[PDB]
């Protein structure tokens, strides 16, 4: 399979309680490896995986410098957006940024990302071609015009195809044991009486990595999709993930249902039956 690196940054204004708080986190696939919190005491980029601690002081100094500059950029962008929309300074607003790159099983550049959201919704995004922008409203079109005039797409593409890829490859190598693993899901089924006419069948997947997984229910062989309760995939806390899907079943009909599990650490997809 392929791999990804992503940084997610959030800025949150708090009027009457000082300056906006800025949080940034770094991920390779579904493994966090760095954080920065503008409210914390260290004022440094900090490690959050074992395999990144081996990096020297030259690394923590340049990364801290780059992330602090970004925090100041987005603190001003919050002020700019307030003007573009003529919003009240008493309100609490949010600015989110996501950027990063995907490689293929050869380390070949597959795709790059560089996008902003304001108050939980798309603001401006670098298109898949890495050469123009998507602007989601009139305020974002002001920024689009400015960034076109200043060749920002060229600047960021250079980062995404060079630095971003070089870093991801270096992290994949340095953390091969943890990042280049798959853990297949351990699976089982639980049974929960509701009344005397109904019972919940729950299909479980535990201990898997990466997080992406598909769990479906069938009855005689046809999809039971809108009668299925399906929870969000959740972290165990040890680096693996968990998920379940459930269906309500009439008494005596348990044997009509099958659960189906797809995951990349599985050689073939699984079928489970009560």
């Amino acid at each position: 399979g392929s791999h990804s690196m992503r940084y997610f940054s959030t800025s949150v204004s708090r009027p009457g309680r000082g300056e906006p708080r800025f949080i940034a986190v770094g991920y390779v696939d579904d493994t966090q490896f760095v954080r920065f919190d503008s409210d914390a005491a260290s004022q440094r980029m900090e490690p959050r995986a074992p395999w990144i601690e081996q990096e020297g002081p030259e690394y923590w100094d340049e990364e801290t410098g780059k992330v602090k500059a970004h925090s100041q950029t987005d603190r001003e962008n919050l002020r700019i957006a307030l003007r573009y929309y003529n919003q009240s300074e008493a309100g609490s607003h949010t600015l989110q940024m996501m950027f990063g790159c995907d490689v293929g099983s050869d380390g070949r550049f597959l795709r790059g990302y560089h996008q902003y959201a304001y108050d939980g919704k798309d603001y401006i995004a670098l298109k898949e071609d890495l050469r123009s922008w998507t602007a989601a409203d009139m305020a974002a079109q002001i920024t689009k015009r400015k960034w076109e005039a200043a060749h920002v797409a060229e600047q960021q593409r250079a980062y995404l195809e060079g630095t971003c890829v070089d870093g991801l490859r270096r992290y994949l190598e340095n953390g091969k044991e943890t990042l280049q693993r798959t853990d297949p899901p351990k699976t089982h089924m639980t049974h929960h009486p509701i009344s005397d006419h109904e019972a919940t069948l729950r299909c479980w997947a535990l201990g898997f990595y990466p997080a992406e997984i598909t769990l479906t229910w069938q009855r005689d062989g046809e999809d039971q999709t809108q009668d299925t309760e399906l929870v969000e995939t959740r972290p165990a806390g040890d680096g693996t993930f968990q998920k379940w899907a459930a269906v309500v079943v009439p008494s005596g009909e348990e044997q009509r249902y099958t659960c189906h599990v797809q995951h990349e650490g599985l050689p073939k997809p699984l079928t489970l039956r009560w």
């Binding site: 940084y7 770094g26 980029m45 990364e63 780059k66 992330v67 500059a69 970004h70 950029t73 987005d74 001003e76 962008n77 700019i80 957006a81 573009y84 940024m97 950027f99 560089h114 902003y116 603001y123 401006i124 974002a140 002001i142 920024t143 400015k146 960034w147 200043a150 920002v152 600047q155 960021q156 980062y159 630095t163 971003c164 070089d166 870093g167």
Partner: peptide
């Protein structure tokens, strides 16, 4: 490795 340039909306 972080990006080196953010700029202004």
């Amino acid at each position: 490795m972080y990006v080196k340039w953010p700029w202004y909306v």
